[PDB]
């Protein structure tokens, strides 16, 4: 008794260009499955037309992974001259107790390293400044460097918020409601890697492994250019 996101034409294209992973890396639904009305407690359309992702547990996810319409996985040159752009209108609800960080958008390499995570965090300390209840950008410093550069993007609101990720020419930019919040961050450390976008709910370091993270997307698209 869950309504499928495929019933809304605003999602047809991105679902054609995605596969759904849940609760870890295994695909539960490919593009054709998604287009054919795939729906579950962790992936469904709300009555006000949000695509909602929900998942409990440490490092568990309900997440769309960028695909080509051919069925090939997206694997674009992370630092190439072609622009790759992800856009999403996301409402981040107040998270359940014990949910401490939820990753909502990513640029991931074709191996084991997230180039970029955009996440909600309960608390973060960056160079001696603690922020509470914010949306954060985390860019990994390298494949062999587990550390990352972190940038607060936005004070958390439940209001629908426009996020835009633009990747081109070894630089990455993020806009939030039209305002640039990360301006041409360097990602040259992923020269020679291939990349793709992800979107959904990825539950990072919960303190209650039974609590549900929950993220809602009113619009989602990923594109190439030139």
Ligand X SMILES: O=C(O)[C@H]1O[C@@H](O[C@H]2[C@H](O)[C@H](O)[C@@H](O)O[C@@H]2C(=O)O)[C@@H](O)[C@@H](O)[C@@H]1O
CB of 100 to ligand X, least distance (A): 10
The verdict on whether residue 117 carries a ligand-binding annotation is yes
- Of residues 36 through 75, those in contact with ligand X by CB under 6 A are 59
Dihedral over alpha carbons 11, 104, 173, 132 (to 10 degrees): 140
Residue partners of 25: CB distance under 8 A and separation at least 6: none
Residue from 54, 138, 170, 212 in contact with ligand X (CB under 6 A): 138
Which residue from 85, 124, 148, 185 is in contact with ligand X, where contact means CB under 6 A? 148
Nearest to 163 by CA among 96, 92, 77, 108: 92
- Listed ranges 10-18, 87-95, 143-151, 157-165: which one lies at the site for ligand X (CB under 6 A): 143-151
> Shortest distance, CB of residue 142 to ligand X, whole angstroms?
10
* Least Å from the CB of residue 206 to ligand X: 11
Kindly write out the interface string for residues 88-127 of this chain, putting x where it contacts ligand X by CB under 6 A and - elsewhere: --------------------------x--x----------
Q: Which of 88, 55, 70 is nearest to 175 (CA)?
A: 88
Query: Using CB atoms, what's the residue nearest to ligand X?
Result: 148
Among 172, 204, 214, 218, contact with ligand X (rule: CB under 6 A)? 204
* One-character DSSP codes across 85-110: EEEEEEE-PPPPTT--EEEEEEEEES
Task: Give the integer Cα–Cα distance in Å for 34 and 12.
Answer: 9
Q: How far is CA 154 from CA 14, 124, 199, in A?
A: 25, 13, 18
Nearer to ligand X (CB atom), residue 6 or residue 193: 193
For ligand X, which is the closer residue by CB, 40 or 148? Answer: 148
202 is in an annotated binding site: yes
160 belongs to an annotated ligand binding site? no
> CA separation (Å) from 224 to 68, 106, 140?
11, 16, 23
Cβ contacts of residue 156 below 8 Å, gap of 6+?
Answer: 92, 120, 133, 134, 135
Q: Footprint of ligand X on this chain (CB under 6 A)?
A: 59, 114, 117, 138, 140, 146-148, 204
Binding positions for alpha-D-mannuronate are 117, 140, 202
Binding positions are 117, 140, 202
């Amino acid at each position: 008794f869950y309504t499928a996101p495929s019933t809304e034409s605003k999602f047809t294209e991105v679902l054609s260009k995605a596969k759904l992973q849940y609760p870890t890396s295994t695909t539960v639904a490919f593009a054709d499955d998604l287009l054919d009305g795939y729906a579950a407690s962790y992936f469904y359309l709300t009555s006000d037309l949000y695509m909602q992702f929900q998942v409990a547990g440490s490092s568990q996810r309900s997440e769309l992974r960028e695909m080509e319409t051919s069925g090939d996985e997206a694997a674009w040159d992370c630092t190439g001259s072609t622009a790759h752009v992800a856009s999403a209108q996301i409402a981040i609800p107040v998270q359940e107790d014990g949910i401490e960080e939820v990753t909502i958008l990513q640029v991931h390499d074709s191996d084991v390293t997230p180039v970029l995570r955009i996440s909600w965090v309960s608390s973060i300390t960056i160079d001696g400044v603690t922020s509470e209840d914010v949306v954060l950008a985390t860019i990994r410093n390298g494949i062999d460097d587990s550390t990352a550069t972190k940038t607060v993007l936005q004070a958390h609101t439940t209001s629908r918020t426009e996020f835009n990720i633009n990747v081109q020419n070894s630089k990455l930019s993020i806009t939030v409601d039209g305002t640039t919040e990360l301006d041409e961050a360097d990602i040259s450390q992923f020269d020679g890697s291939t990349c793709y976008f992800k979107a959904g709910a990825y539950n990072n370091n919960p303190t209650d492994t039974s609590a549900n993270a929950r993220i809602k997307m009113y619009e989602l698209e990923w594109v190439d250019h030139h």
